[PDB]
Amino acid sequence: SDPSSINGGIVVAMTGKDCVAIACDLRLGSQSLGVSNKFEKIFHYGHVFLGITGLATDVTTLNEMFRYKTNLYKLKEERAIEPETFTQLVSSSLYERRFGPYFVGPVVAGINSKSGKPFIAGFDLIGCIDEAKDFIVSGTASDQLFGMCESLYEPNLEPEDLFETISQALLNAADRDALSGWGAVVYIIKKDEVVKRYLKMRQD
Amino acid sequence: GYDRALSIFSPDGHIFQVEYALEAVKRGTCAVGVKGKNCVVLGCERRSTLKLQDTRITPSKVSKIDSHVVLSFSGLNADSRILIEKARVEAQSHRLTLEDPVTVEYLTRYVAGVQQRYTQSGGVR
């Protein structure tokens, strides 16, 4: 009965040279039972990408909530929300439920359309912002991801090289976690193009 | 506890207590075993100095150890009961753990082992 490890799953985000990457596994289970291998944990609102790990009902609920809020933002502001602004919105929304929190580990990723600066961020379940140049990790194999990212990561990687680093970080972290894996998706995000790749991995 | 080594070697290399136990066997009533092609027969002598006996209730010379094995003897009658009891207990213990009754060789090996133990244990004859 630990909300953060009932459904399982992982998200990882990295920065590169004029680009960002965000990736996640596809597993959704009920403890030992694998239920779905199509459960994607990454969503996007305009050009800002959000990955969410943890309790699957809250993953879904928060996606619907941030879609709701970014749509109203766009109508009123007459422009798409930026990663820096969205990060503050995620934090505010999570802390609003301080004593009844969503059991999640969100990860923001994106490129600022004005400045062109690659941006990533992570949060704890009550909204504490973890800003980072290098990488952000979340989920039931976060320890494994921290180890993989710390050793494999180097600054200023090109999109094609960054893809290999983030993919290998996720895959090998997932294979050392029982509640993660069952497929994987990787988003490579450039200033004005986004490539989505499904990875081949072991299905156990 | 009584520890005395009763069964011991002599200068000539004999254990007299074991050899004197054989003399007790030589005194006992005769017992014979003959095995055929599809059977075994155990014959036993009963001395005829004892009349007015009750043959219904008098301990029989041949004793069943299990439903498939029997034991006859010659020598001290009281001593034989201790071996027979131990043998019967081992027979049931074997069925319990091995899920199979004892072989005749196994049962013999057990009884023989008990007899041997009493030739080099303290305080026993």
């Binding site: 289970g29 050392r176 029982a178 509640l179 072991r202 | 091995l98």
Partner: protein
């Protein structure tokens, strides 16, 4: 863990996985969950690694002492009972074992005994033990027949572990196969689930739930 063993026309199939877990941490993917007691006796391991590994190797020593003393290979029944009587002495102390003693002898023929740490001992044709036992049962029962060939039987045992490795989070790594005949046991290799899954998916047309 997922282990199985079933009886059929051509003897006994035994199949296990190779994953070891400490909570949600995958400790190992290359664990030997079959113990080779002797050329005619196998033992499967589920539950606590140390309990299974220690006591089943101890069991082999006891089986060896039996054939020295009795000049005859121990029966599957007698071997299984030594283990079951041992764990029964420890009942309540916290041993965790789900084991299957499999073998062939002249008097018994191909025989499988299920033995666990709370003292249960059962003879049977089909058994699956472990966290993924239900997944293995589902595939095994629906495709099982007595008149299976040795080839089809080996595959079914392999396919049943694969099914469990896929669905059960605490089962995986690889599949270890064994076949037991009148002549003894025969090892049929280590099969990595990483490659085996895609091979089976393609050739069989199964596993449509997965993104191919």
């Amino acid at each position: 863990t997922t282990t199985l063993a079933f009886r059929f026309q051509g003897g006994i199939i035994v199949a296990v996985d190779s994953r070891a877990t400490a909570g949600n941490w995958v400790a190992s993917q290359t664990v030997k969950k079959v113990i080779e007691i002797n050329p005619f006796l196998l033992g499967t391991m589920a539950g606590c690694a140390a309990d299974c590994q220690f006591w089943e190797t101890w069991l082999g020593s006891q089986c060896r002492l039996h054939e020295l003393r009795e000049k005859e290979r121990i029966s599957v029944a007698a071997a299984s009972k030594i283990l079951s009587n041992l764990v029964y002495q420890y009942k309540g102390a916290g041993l965790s074992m789900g084991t299957m003693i499999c073998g062939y002898t002249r008097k018994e023929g191909p025989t499988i005994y299920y033995v666990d740490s709370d003292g249960t001992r059962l003879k049977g044709d089909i058994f699956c033990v472990g966290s993924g036992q239900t997944f293995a049962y589902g595939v095994l029962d629906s495709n099982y027949k007595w008149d299976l060939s040795v080839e089809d039987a080996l595959y079914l045992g392999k396919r049943s572990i694969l099914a469990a490795a896929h669905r059960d989070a605490y089962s995986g790594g690889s599949v270890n196969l064994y076949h037991v005949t009148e002549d003894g046991w025969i090892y049929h290799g280590n099969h990595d689930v990483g490659e085996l899954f895609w091979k089976v998916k393609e050739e069989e047309g199964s596993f449509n739930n997965v993104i191919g």
